[PDB]
């Protein structure tokens, strides 16, 4: 991998050979084709799932939902052409993305139809039917979560990813709980390190010891980060990981900060979230031993938009931990209001 | 950090940010021109080391040895300005670079006046005395190993827009047993990863699960690799690390291969070494329960230059491990000849 780079703190410049990790989260990627195997086989799997009482699917990540949306119509066309009476409905996804107990099957053979959908870009209608294969959406009361699928896809290749941007997928044959490794990359160089995937970008630094620096998340998955793609795993207790192990947090010393316990009650209902160790505008934090115990995350602004100025914590290390979202600022559990009725506070929606 | 990438495996020309780690091992010889900061203080440190009973130095890495061999002159010149009577003699290195019990002092205050170093870096004139502060060489008898120093320097800053970037070293203040972290880099991307430093380049990939791929060695240190710069440290026993922990091997699953134990008696005396999992030319390795027990590693050719064509092992996975050196091709400890007696072959020297 011949390449080059330019420093920003300095002007050191060079090409050469090495290994290069790229940040694709804030860049927002670009248009992806997301070839979901052969739509013929996807149709066969969809039919086979219905025969065994499988209602819908729950998207692990935002890529899966977009792939479903982009292949919706042609799948319906294939179903209509062959002897099938079923409809697929796709809807907006919400966070956090919960785990489904079912897994889509792998058909032994393929539907007897004219296989013309390989590479078909939507733009086709089908006959509506009473029975529908709902994908996410708000189709919950129609069928509860216990009859949904989850994490059944496995990235196959990146054929012509530079310009055609084709991500090839497949249906896996293994039950698993870990996130897809084919899109994970982490590196350390001197006094800086980073863990990243298509939705997570986490940065760590050494200051008297390795610690968490900053994180930017556009999705909240529920798989678990594999160990092989993690730095310095041993010697840490899961009670201390800032990003919960249940929300796909790495098992690392780099994922820790001293004076803070694991954040399992944060505002994980948002769409875009940034973790920053800083005070938000108009707020201050003091350290006192008489402050309250841990509680749900509270927004810095009242429902009407008023701001609470004074907050206290017990045994936290400055700068304080906070979450940044388009709604406003959310503090961690360790920090509690110094003087404020709990009625005006917007409590984080506990995720279960 | 703007990017520069042309991946020939996939032919993707990207341009973004991230973190990049380069392979600098193959061009090590003259990558820097040091001038360790303030040699007027290094002179006082050497004088005090001589006074206290510290009579020599055993180099930790080839970089330090070249630093000595480049600053030998001006240092002697500074000695010949205040009446000090000592002569620094710098010799050649031998592998492995053993460890020294003592540490170089940190002078309380610099010499009364040593500005003669200003404007005279390399071309200087000095005198000679009887006292010797020997660096390296076949000179143990003049300063016994129990009085040599070792591992007394840290890199403060480095990196410049020049073929030879100036490095600002300093005298370490605290005792330590681990290698300097400021020049270590490692990363993993999909199915490939690498650990490296200025003299180590090690590669691993995924097949069933992660395993060692290859390594390139130009020096054999004796410091310990820090944990923070290691991937997946949990669950590995130190008896399976292919590169021994004492010889600066990392504690990782990436540093393991199935069917082989630690290599404590490999041909670690050669100048530079490369590790490959392939046959030595003109030879084959078998797997046989009846083969011999572990022992010292043997060279594939006799001292007379004749080749040995058949080798065996008991429980090793093919292809076999081997060492590529300037002398010739060697086989691992688990691998012994089938019929020819081992006393006829060349045995490697003892290291501990």
């Amino acid at each position: 991998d011949v390449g080059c780079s330019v420093d920003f703190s300095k002007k050191e410049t060079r090409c050469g050979t090495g290994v290069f990790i790229y940040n694709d989260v804030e860049a927002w990627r670009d248009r992806y084709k997301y070839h979901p195997d052969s739509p013929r086989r996807l149709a066969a799997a969809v039919k086979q799932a219905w025969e065994e009482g499988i209602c819908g699917i729950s998207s692990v990540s935002r890529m899966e939902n977009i792939m479903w949306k982009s292949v919706e119509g042609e799948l319906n066309a294939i179903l209509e052409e062959n002897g099938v009476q079923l409809t697929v409905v796709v809807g907006s996804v919400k966070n956090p993305m919960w785990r489904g107990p079912q897994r889509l099957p792998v058909p032994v053979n393929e539907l007897p139809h004219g296989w013309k959908a390989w590479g078909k870009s939507y733009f086709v209608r089908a006959a509506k039917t009473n029975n529908s294969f709902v994908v996410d959406g708000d189709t919950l009361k129609e069928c509860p979560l216990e009859h949904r699928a989850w994490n059944s896809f496995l990235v196959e290749d990146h054929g012509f990813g530079v310009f055609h941007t084709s991500v090839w997928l497949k249906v896996r044959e293994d039950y698993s709980l870990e996130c897809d490794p084919a899109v994970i990359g982490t590196a350390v160089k001197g006094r800086e390190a980073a863990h990243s995937d298509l939705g997570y970008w986490i940065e760590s630094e050494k200051n008297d010891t390795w610690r968490l620096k900053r994180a930017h998340l556009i999705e909240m998955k529920t798989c678990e980060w594999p160990k092989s793609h993690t730095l310095w795993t041993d010697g840490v207790e899961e009670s201390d990981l800032i990003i919960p192990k249940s929300l796909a947090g790495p098992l690392s010393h780099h994922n820790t900060r001293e004076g803070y316990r694991t954040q399992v009650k944060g505002p994980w209902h948002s769409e875009e979230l940034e973790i920053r160790f800083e005070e938000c505008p108009g707020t201050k934090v003091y350290v006192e031993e008489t402050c309250g115990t841990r509680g749900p995350s509270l927004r810095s602004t009242t429902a009407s938009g008023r701001v609470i100025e004074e907050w206290c914590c017990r045994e936290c290390t400055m700068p304080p931990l906070s979450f940044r979202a388009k709604d406003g600022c959310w503090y961690g559990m360790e920090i509690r209001p110094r003087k404020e009725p709990e009625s005006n506070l917007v409590r984080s929606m506990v995720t279960a | 950090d703007v990017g520069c990438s042309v991946d020939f495996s996939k032919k993707e020309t990207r341009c973004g940010t991230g973190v990049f780690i380069y392979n600098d091992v193959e061009a090590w010889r003259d990558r820097y021109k040091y001038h360790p900061d303030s040699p007027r203080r290094l002179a006082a440190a050497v004088k005090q080391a001589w006074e206290e009973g510290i009579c020599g130095i055993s180099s930790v890495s080839r970089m330090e040895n070249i630093m000595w061999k480049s600053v030998e002159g001006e240092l002697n010149a500074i000695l010949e300005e205040n009446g000090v009577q000592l002569t620094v003699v710098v010799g050649s290195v031998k592998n492995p670079m053993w460890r020294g019990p003592q540490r170089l002092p940190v002078p309380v205050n610099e010499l009364p006046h040593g500005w003669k170093a200003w404007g005279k870096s390399y071309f200087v004139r000095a005198a000679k005395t009887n006292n010797s502060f020997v660096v390296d060489g076949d000179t143990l008898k003049e300063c016994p190993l129990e009085h040599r120093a070792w591992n007394s320097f840290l890199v403060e800053d480095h990196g410049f827009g020049v073929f030879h970037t100036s490095v600002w070293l300093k005298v370490r203040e605290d005792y330590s047993l681990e290698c300097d972290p400021a020049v270590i880099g490692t990363a993993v991307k999909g199915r490939e990863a690498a650990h490296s430093d200025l003299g180590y380049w090690i590669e691993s990939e995924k097949n069933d699960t992660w395993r060692l791929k290859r390594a390139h060695l130009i020096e054999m240190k004796t410091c310990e690799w820090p944990k923070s710069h290691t991937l997946w440290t949990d669950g590995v026993e130190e008896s399976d690390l292919i590169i021994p922990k004492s010889l600066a091997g990392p504690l990782s699953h990436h540093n393991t291969r199935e069917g082989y134990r630690t290599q404590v008696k490999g041909p670690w005396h050669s100048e530079e070494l490369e590790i490959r999992f392939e046959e030595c030319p003109g030879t084959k390795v078998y797997v046989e329960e009846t083969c011999g027990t572990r022992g010292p590693s043997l060279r594939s050719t006799t001292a007379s230059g004749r080749v040995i064509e058949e080798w065996c092992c008991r429980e090793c996975t093919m292809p076999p491990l081997s060492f590529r050196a300037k002398d010739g091709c060697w086989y691992g400890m688990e691998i012994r000849p089938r019929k020819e007696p081992e006393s006829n072959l060349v045995r490697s020297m003892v290291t501990a």
Partner: antibody
Amino acid sequence: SEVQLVESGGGLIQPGGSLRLSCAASGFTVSSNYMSWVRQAPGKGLEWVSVIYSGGSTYYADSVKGRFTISRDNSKNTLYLQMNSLRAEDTAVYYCARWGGKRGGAFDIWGQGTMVTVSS
Amino acid sequence: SDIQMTQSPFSLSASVGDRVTITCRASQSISSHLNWYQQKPGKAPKFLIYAASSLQSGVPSRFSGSGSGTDFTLTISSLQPEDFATYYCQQSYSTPYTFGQGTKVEIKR
């Protein structure tokens, strides 16, 4: 193919000793499925101990944290448990169970079990 | 913290042909990763129900499970003479994988 799990290596041992348990397998490959060890003390319920993922990760229960070690031999198609610092409190029947292929997270196939007695 | 599973009752008495109700409760939401096992004296457990509503291949149609979240139930339509055993409920959401205490089913006398 028929599927089985068969334990071996039980017996009588003194306090502070060590022993190795072997759980063979047939009809499938242990590399592609999660595997665990479960035990049942005389006159008591069931107890899970440790698990090894198909990728290679391992987890342990506190009662044996550090004293035991789980590993698999990908070539011999076997699952191993290494026991050290044994006590009379470890007396129980030990099982090895297979993680279900498709039916959620469930021990689809169990073994017969082996008896381990720790007494001086 | 670990997930605790509390079975109830400790034991119940019933005859052939009655309806038996067994409840299993979890200390935290576990989605629907719940399982039921049946163990006879001197034997290894057996696998009956997964996902809190699905039946394994070969399980008689009498058994049926329901519930979501924390409260789960097991029911038998027509008790048979060969259903005398103990029942355990297990959760498979995350490690450590905990079991239930178990309930003994006995004949009325």
